[PDB]
Amino acid sequence: NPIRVGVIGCADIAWRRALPALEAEPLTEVTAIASRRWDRAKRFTERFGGEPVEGYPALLERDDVDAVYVPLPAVLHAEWIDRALRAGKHVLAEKPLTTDRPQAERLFAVARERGLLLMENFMFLHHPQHRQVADMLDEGVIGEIRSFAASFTIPPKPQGDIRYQADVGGGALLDIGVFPIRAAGLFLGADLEFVGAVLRHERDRDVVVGGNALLTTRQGVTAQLTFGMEHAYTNNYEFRGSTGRLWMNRVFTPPATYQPVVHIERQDHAEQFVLPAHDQFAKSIRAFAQAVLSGEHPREWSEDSLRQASLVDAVRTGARDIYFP
């Protein structure tokens, strides 16, 4: 019997990625979709099925909901994950899970006490391309790794976007910079430590719109991370090694049908490998539903989410903040 999923917040990411995955996944059934406006709920259910619900508390009270997907603005994640967990629902929370490490520990504790899964939906972790890259690096294709760079920058969102409100969307670090920071954790491991960063704050709206961070492992393998929403589109990572370098585009949000290309360069020789296409949004939703159904809640997911939250806090706290103009 599929797990019955309810959605709180009719989010663009829900309409674009999450809900088509839920609807097509045999293991999950969309039973209710809640919105602050019934009309918006209803438009979502007409598209993806389930009962449309006005307001979020009503959905949490439902007996036919087993798990709740929370694609709310970052700043609002915590209140509603806490309430969904106390309603007895497992939770798939969008990235970033929350805004800081102590808040994240408290949410995992509420979950832990009730045996419930809380999962941060970094769907890109579920795309096989990253492990195919890590396997090439482990095979020595570029020698020992010296440093890492990752970038996710996008052109400015329309006025009114959730990201232009510090206390709803919380801006380019919480909502975009979390990606390169997460890829640095995936590839360089659990001992990354903050070294320096810059955050550009737009005075007009009072929100972070771009930044760059420098992290290091204790062996001095550095990560240089760029993020922002005042920029042309970039979405890439690159490794510099002792005998070569490796890079790739569309690393955080490859289409379901899009075939990645790994680029390698070494002295007098370069290569590109075409990898198979995969649907990372389907795979992450599948992973969630299998954990819920089996009761096997991987310990690494919550430990990585906690470390991720610490590094984000370390960047925010450590950065030089520059306001413009």
Ligand X SMILES: NC(=O)c1ccc[n+]([C@@H]2O[C@H](COP(=O)([O-])OP(=O)(O)OC[C@H]3O[C@@H](n4cnc5c(N)ncnc54)[C@H](OP(=O)(O)O)[C@@H]3O)[C@@H](O)[C@H]2O)c1
Ligand Y SMILES: Cc1cn([C@H]2C[C@H](O)[C@@H](COP(=O)(O)OP(=O)(O)Oc3ccccc3)O2)c(=O)[nH]c1=O
Nearer to ligand Y, 177 or 241 (CB): 177
CA dist., res. 222 & res. 146, Å (int)? 7
CA dist., res. 117 & res. 130, Å (int)? 24
Selecting among 42, 95, 157, 283, the annotated active-site residue is 95
Residue 279, contacted partner among Na ion, ligand Y, ligand X, none, CB below 5-8 A by kind? none
Site string for ligand Y, 107-146 (x = CB under 6 A): ----------------------------------------
To the question of whether residue 162 is assigned a binding role by annotation, the answer is no
How many helices (DSSP H) and strands (DSSP E) are in the chain?
11, 15
Least CB distance to ligand Y at residue 196 (A):
24
Q: Catalytic annotation on 95? A: yes
Select the residue interacting with ligand X from 22, 30, 31, 35 (CB under 6 A): 35
CA dist., res. 238 & res. 247, Å (int)? 4
Site string for ligand Y, 250-279 (x = CB under 6 A): ---x--------------------------
Q: Report in angstroms the alpha-carbon separations of 101 from 84, 108, 273.
A: 19, 11, 38
CA dist., res. 23 & res. 107, Å (int)? 27
Residue 283, contacted partner among ligand X, ligand Y, Na ion, none, CB below 5-8 A by kind? none
Select the residue interacting with ligand X from 71, 177, 185, 241 (CB under 6 A): 71
CA dist., res. 269 & res. 205, Å (int)? 48
Radius of gyration of the chain (CA): 20
To the question of whether residue 19 is assigned a binding role by annotation, the answer is no
Catalytic residues: 95
